[PDB]
Amino acid sequence: MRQRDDSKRIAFLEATVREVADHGFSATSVGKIAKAAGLSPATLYIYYEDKEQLLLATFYYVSDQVIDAALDSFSRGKDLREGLRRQWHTLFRIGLERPELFRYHETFTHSAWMTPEIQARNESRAANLLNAVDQGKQSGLIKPVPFPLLETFMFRPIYHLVQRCLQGSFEGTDEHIELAFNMAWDAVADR
Amino acid sequence: QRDDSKRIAFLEATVREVADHGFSATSVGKIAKAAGLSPATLYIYYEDKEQLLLATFYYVSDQVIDAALDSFSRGKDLREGLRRQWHTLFRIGLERPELFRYHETFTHSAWMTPEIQARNESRAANLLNAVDQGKQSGLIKPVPFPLLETFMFRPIYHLVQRCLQGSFEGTDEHIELAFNMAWDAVADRRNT
């Protein structure tokens, strides 16, 4: 059955997330992922050619889960600010509950496994979000600034604050998450 | 004076080696070698690795905090002070990113303690007290300090890194625009 195949794939994907988040890429072998998933390496090779391919499938599994949830939340907002606000809360919750997804993404994107094609693929999946933000630049809602700046003030602070919350230097209350969003919005909002 | 110079050689070698290879890989011997001096010489000034790493953290922090305080004090008001400090910090990151990396590596390590934190907050008191007053006066949003750190200081580190990796151009104009965004993030909008 397909459902059995998918269950096994999810086991390997989740195992790779945990192992790499705890130990990094180098220390994490095919053998170790398989053992963490509770399956044999022979079974791993039925689904993934090699380590490289499983690390990339895992990157897409992590990225798609996060992007899809963000997009779903964003789609419920009646205007750009509300959409971004709903997405922000959603991403904060994902980071607080599944920080390993954030850590896998971060480790991957800053490694030699990352490529422009991989970035473009995730950008394409996040299209509805990115195009909405671009359209806010055109309409005078969002400062007409290069994207690196928008990323710095509207996306990156979520990662940083989730880390501080989990390390005990900030309390991840709904009130504090909203305050942070308010600040991200003010940063990017055209005056 | 000549004492300050041998010391500087060791402190700078510590900054370079740790920034490049991390703490665990950096021994007294490699720091001494990087400095062009013997471990026996190193031990004249620093008792062991622990003490050299701490002294290096204070050297890095003092260099940066003092430059920031100096620039902040030339501002004609709070916003101008923060804008000048921002430009000075961004320039320091561009020229000496190893200072930022040493600070980051150390603060995110087991060597870091609340007492060390407090000592740096103390040296920076004039800035932090002015920012705190701004939180009650209508200038700065009355939010927890970790949010102020997130939107007013951390973006300098992130943008410096992007500049050095080629994903952002660190022109005077761009540095100013980024500060305007950071200010908008932290600034209390009541009455405007």
mmCIF file of N, CA, C and O in Angstrom, chain A residues 83-129:
data_model
loop_
_atom_site.group_PDB
_atom_site.id
_atom_site.type_symbol
_atom_site.label_atom_id
_atom_site.label_comp_id
_atom_site.label_asym_id
_atom_site.label_seq_id
_atom_site.Cartn_x
_atom_site.Cartn_y
_atom_site.Cartn_z
ATOM 1 N N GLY A 83 -3.251 39.207 7.362
ATOM 2 C CA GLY A 83 -2.681 37.965 6.805
ATOM 3 C C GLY A 83 -1.315 37.698 7.388
ATOM 4 O O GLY A 83 -1.032 36.591 7.862
ATOM 5 N N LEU A 84 -0.472 38.717 7.361
ATOM 6 C CA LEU A 84 0.869 38.594 7.899
ATOM 7 C C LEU A 84 0.827 38.359 9.421
ATOM 8 O O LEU A 84 1.626 37.582 9.952
ATOM 9 N N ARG A 85 -0.155 38.966 10.107
ATOM 10 C CA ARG A 85 -0.296 38.791 11.547
ATOM 11 C C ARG A 85 -0.663 37.344 11.876
ATOM 12 O O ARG A 85 -0.061 36.738 12.739
ATOM 13 N N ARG A 86 -1.625 36.795 11.152
ATOM 14 C CA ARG A 86 -2.052 35.380 11.361
ATOM 15 C C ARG A 86 -0.901 34.426 11.065
ATOM 16 O O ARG A 86 -0.606 33.509 11.838
ATOM 17 N N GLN A 87 -0.205 34.651 9.954
ATOM 18 C CA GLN A 87 0.974 33.866 9.600
ATOM 19 C C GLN A 87 2.070 33.928 10.658
ATOM 20 O O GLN A 87 2.782 32.959 10.901
ATOM 21 N N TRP A 88 2.246 35.107 11.246
ATOM 22 C CA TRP A 88 3.291 35.311 12.220
ATOM 23 C C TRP A 88 3.055 34.441 13.448
ATOM 24 O O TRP A 88 3.975 33.685 13.877
ATOM 25 N N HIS A 89 1.837 34.525 13.985
ATOM 26 C CA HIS A 89 1.407 33.699 15.115
ATOM 27 C C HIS A 89 1.565 32.197 14.834
ATOM 28 O O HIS A 89 2.047 31.438 15.688
ATOM 29 N N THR A 90 1.209 31.792 13.624
ATOM 30 C CA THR A 90 1.306 30.391 13.210
ATOM 31 C C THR A 90 2.775 29.947 13.203
ATOM 32 O O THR A 90 3.109 28.893 13.754
ATOM 33 N N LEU A 91 3.643 30.758 12.601
ATOM 34 C CA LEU A 91 5.068 30.407 12.510
ATOM 35 C C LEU A 91 5.657 30.371 13.931
ATOM 36 O O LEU A 91 6.477 29.525 14.252
ATOM 37 N N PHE A 92 5.283 31.316 14.773
ATOM 38 C CA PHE A 92 5.791 31.328 16.154
ATOM 39 C C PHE A 92 5.408 30.061 16.892
ATOM 40 O O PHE A 92 6.238 29.473 17.588
ATOM 41 N N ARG A 93 4.164 29.616 16.713
ATOM 42 C CA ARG A 93 3.681 28.392 17.342
ATOM 43 C C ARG A 93 4.455 27.168 16.806
ATOM 44 O O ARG A 93 4.889 26.309 17.569
ATOM 45 N N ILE A 94 4.672 27.112 15.501
ATOM 46 C CA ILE A 94 5.425 26.006 14.932
ATOM 47 C C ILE A 94 6.850 25.979 15.512
ATOM 48 O O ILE A 94 7.368 24.915 15.869
ATOM 49 N N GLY A 95 7.498 27.137 15.573
ATOM 50 C CA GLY A 95 8.843 27.188 16.133
ATOM 51 C C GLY A 95 8.875 26.723 17.588
ATOM 52 O O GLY A 95 9.800 26.025 18.010
ATOM 53 N N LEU A 96 7.873 27.111 18.362
ATOM 54 C CA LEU A 96 7.823 26.761 19.803
ATOM 55 C C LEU A 96 7.503 25.332 20.054
ATOM 56 O O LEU A 96 7.970 24.756 21.060
ATOM 57 N N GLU A 97 6.734 24.730 19.148
ATOM 58 C CA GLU A 97 6.308 23.352 19.338
ATOM 59 C C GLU A 97 7.161 22.369 18.589
ATOM 60 O O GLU A 97 7.311 21.194 19.023
ATOM 61 N N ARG A 98 7.696 22.806 17.454
ATOM 62 C CA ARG A 98 8.529 21.939 16.615
ATOM 63 C C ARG A 98 9.780 22.697 16.238
ATOM 64 O O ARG A 98 10.071 22.929 15.068
ATOM 65 N N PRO A 99 10.541 23.124 17.236
ATOM 66 C CA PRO A 99 11.773 23.862 16.910
ATOM 67 C C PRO A 99 12.742 23.095 16.008
ATOM 68 O O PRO A 99 13.569 23.712 15.277
ATOM 69 N N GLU A 100 12.724 21.769 16.101
ATOM 70 C CA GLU A 100 13.578 20.956 15.241
ATOM 71 C C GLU A 100 13.330 21.226 13.731
ATOM 72 O O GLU A 100 14.274 21.077 12.923
ATOM 73 N N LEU A 101 12.096 21.596 13.347
ATOM 74 C CA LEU A 101 11.808 21.960 11.938
ATOM 75 C C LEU A 101 12.569 23.237 11.543
ATOM 76 O O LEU A 101 13.203 23.299 10.508
ATOM 77 N N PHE A 102 12.508 24.241 12.413
ATOM 78 C CA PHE A 102 13.257 25.454 12.251
ATOM 79 C C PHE A 102 14.762 25.157 12.197
ATOM 80 O O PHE A 102 15.448 25.726 11.361
ATOM 81 N N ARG A 103 15.261 24.319 13.120
ATOM 82 C CA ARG A 103 16.701 24.021 13.183
ATOM 83 C C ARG A 103 17.172 23.255 11.943
ATOM 84 O O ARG A 103 18.226 23.551 11.398
ATOM 85 N N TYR A 104 16.382 22.287 11.481
ATOM 86 C CA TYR A 104 16.730 21.600 10.223
ATOM 87 C C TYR A 104 16.829 22.589 9.054
ATOM 88 O O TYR A 104 17.807 22.599 8.332
ATOM 89 N N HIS A 105 15.865 23.487 8.936
ATOM 90 C CA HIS A 105 15.820 24.441 7.840
ATOM 91 C C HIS A 105 17.042 25.352 7.846
ATOM 92 O O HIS A 105 17.694 25.587 6.822
ATOM 93 N N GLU A 106 17.334 25.851 9.031
ATOM 94 C CA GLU A 106 18.445 26.745 9.247
ATOM 95 C C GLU A 106 19.802 26.090 8.960
ATOM 96 O O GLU A 106 20.654 26.687 8.309
ATOM 97 N N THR A 107 19.985 24.865 9.451
ATOM 98 C CA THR A 107 21.228 24.118 9.275
ATOM 99 C C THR A 107 21.406 23.862 7.774
ATOM 100 O O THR A 107 22.482 24.153 7.181
ATOM 101 N N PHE A 108 20.322 23.441 7.138
ATOM 102 C CA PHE A 108 20.384 23.128 5.716
ATOM 103 C C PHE A 108 20.716 24.357 4.872
ATOM 104 O O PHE A 108 21.660 24.318 4.048
ATOM 105 N N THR A 109 19.929 25.422 5.045
ATOM 106 C CA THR A 109 20.110 26.644 4.228
ATOM 107 C C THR A 109 21.489 27.280 4.396
ATOM 108 O O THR A 109 21.949 27.970 3.501
ATOM 109 N N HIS A 110 22.167 27.016 5.499
ATOM 110 C CA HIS A 110 23.505 27.576 5.686
ATOM 111 C C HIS A 110 24.602 26.543 5.447
ATOM 112 O O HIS A 110 25.699 26.703 5.965
ATOM 113 N N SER A 111 24.312 25.482 4.678
ATOM 114 C CA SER A 111 25.280 24.409 4.405
ATOM 115 C C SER A 111 25.553 24.398 2.930
ATOM 116 O O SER A 111 24.826 25.047 2.170
ATOM 117 N N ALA A 112 26.548 23.611 2.525
ATOM 118 C CA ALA A 112 26.874 23.466 1.120
ATOM 119 C C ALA A 112 25.851 22.644 0.356
ATOM 120 O O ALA A 112 26.014 22.452 -0.848
ATOM 121 N N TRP A 113 24.804 22.148 1.026
ATOM 122 C CA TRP A 113 23.780 21.419 0.311
ATOM 123 C C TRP A 113 22.784 22.397 -0.331
ATOM 124 O O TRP A 113 22.027 22.009 -1.221
ATOM 125 N N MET A 114 22.771 23.640 0.141
ATOM 126 C CA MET A 114 21.837 24.651 -0.347
ATOM 127 C C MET A 114 22.255 25.240 -1.689
ATOM 128 O O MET A 114 23.432 25.491 -1.930
ATOM 129 N N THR A 115 21.274 25.465 -2.554
ATOM 130 C CA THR A 115 21.519 25.959 -3.880
ATOM 131 C C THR A 115 20.431 26.946 -4.294
ATOM 132 O O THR A 115 19.298 26.920 -3.759
ATOM 133 N N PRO A 116 20.746 27.788 -5.280
ATOM 134 C CA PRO A 116 19.777 28.725 -5.789
ATOM 135 C C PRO A 116 18.495 28.080 -6.302
ATOM 136 O O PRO A 116 17.422 28.630 -6.109
ATOM 137 N N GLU A 117 18.605 26.935 -6.960
ATOM 138 C CA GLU A 117 17.458 26.181 -7.423
ATOM 139 C C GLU A 117 16.539 25.759 -6.258
ATOM 140 O O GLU A 117 15.307 25.741 -6.389
ATOM 141 N N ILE A 118 17.150 25.381 -5.135
ATOM 142 C CA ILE A 118 16.375 24.929 -3.958
ATOM 143 C C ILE A 118 15.642 26.154 -3.383
ATOM 144 O O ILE A 118 14.451 26.078 -3.088
ATOM 145 N N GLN A 119 16.356 27.273 -3.262
ATOM 146 C CA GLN A 119 15.745 28.522 -2.816
ATOM 147 C C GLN A 119 14.571 28.913 -3.716
ATOM 148 O O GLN A 119 13.508 29.260 -3.214
ATOM 149 N N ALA A 120 14.753 28.850 -5.039
ATOM 150 C CA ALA A 120 13.690 29.190 -5.986
ATOM 151 C C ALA A 120 12.458 28.299 -5.836
ATOM 152 O O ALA A 120 11.308 28.738 -5.990
ATOM 153 N N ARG A 121 12.696 27.023 -5.597
ATOM 154 C CA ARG A 121 11.629 26.092 -5.414
ATOM 155 C C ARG A 121 10.784 26.522 -4.182
ATOM 156 O O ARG A 121 9.566 26.593 -4.277
ATOM 157 N N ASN A 122 11.412 26.793 -3.036
ATOM 158 C CA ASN A 122 10.649 27.236 -1.840
ATOM 159 C C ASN A 122 9.961 28.585 -2.081
ATOM 160 O O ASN A 122 8.816 28.782 -1.667
ATOM 161 N N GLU A 123 10.656 29.491 -2.762
ATOM 162 C CA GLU A 123 10.045 30.792 -3.163
ATOM 163 C C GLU A 123 8.808 30.608 -4.026
ATOM 164 O O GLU A 123 7.788 31.291 -3.810
ATOM 165 N N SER A 124 8.875 29.648 -4.959
ATOM 166 C CA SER A 124 7.732 29.333 -5.772
ATOM 167 C C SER A 124 6.585 28.811 -4.906
ATOM 168 O O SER A 124 5.468 29.276 -5.045
ATOM 169 N N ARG A 125 6.851 27.906 -3.973
ATOM 170 C CA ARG A 125 5.779 27.400 -3.092
ATOM 171 C C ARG A 125 5.129 28.491 -2.228
ATOM 172 O O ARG A 125 3.928 28.422 -1.953
ATOM 173 N N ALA A 126 5.940 29.458 -1.792
ATOM 174 C CA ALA A 126 5.479 30.648 -1.007
ATOM 175 C C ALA A 126 5.007 31.839 -1.863
ATOM 176 O O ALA A 126 4.782 32.946 -1.338
ATOM 177 N N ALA A 127 4.799 31.601 -3.158
ATOM 178 C CA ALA A 127 4.377 32.624 -4.125
ATOM 179 C C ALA A 127 3.240 33.548 -3.698
ATOM 180 O O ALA A 127 3.351 34.775 -3.859
ATOM 181 N N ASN A 128 2.149 32.975 -3.184
ATOM 182 C CA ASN A 128 0.963 33.774 -2.807
ATOM 183 C C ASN A 128 1.329 34.813 -1.721
ATOM 184 O O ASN A 128 0.895 35.971 -1.770
ATOM 185 N N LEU A 129 2.197 34.422 -0.797
ATOM 186 C CA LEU A 129 2.710 35.314 0.243
ATOM 187 C C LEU A 129 3.620 36.372 -0.354
ATOM 188 O O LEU A 129 3.403 37.599 -0.204
#
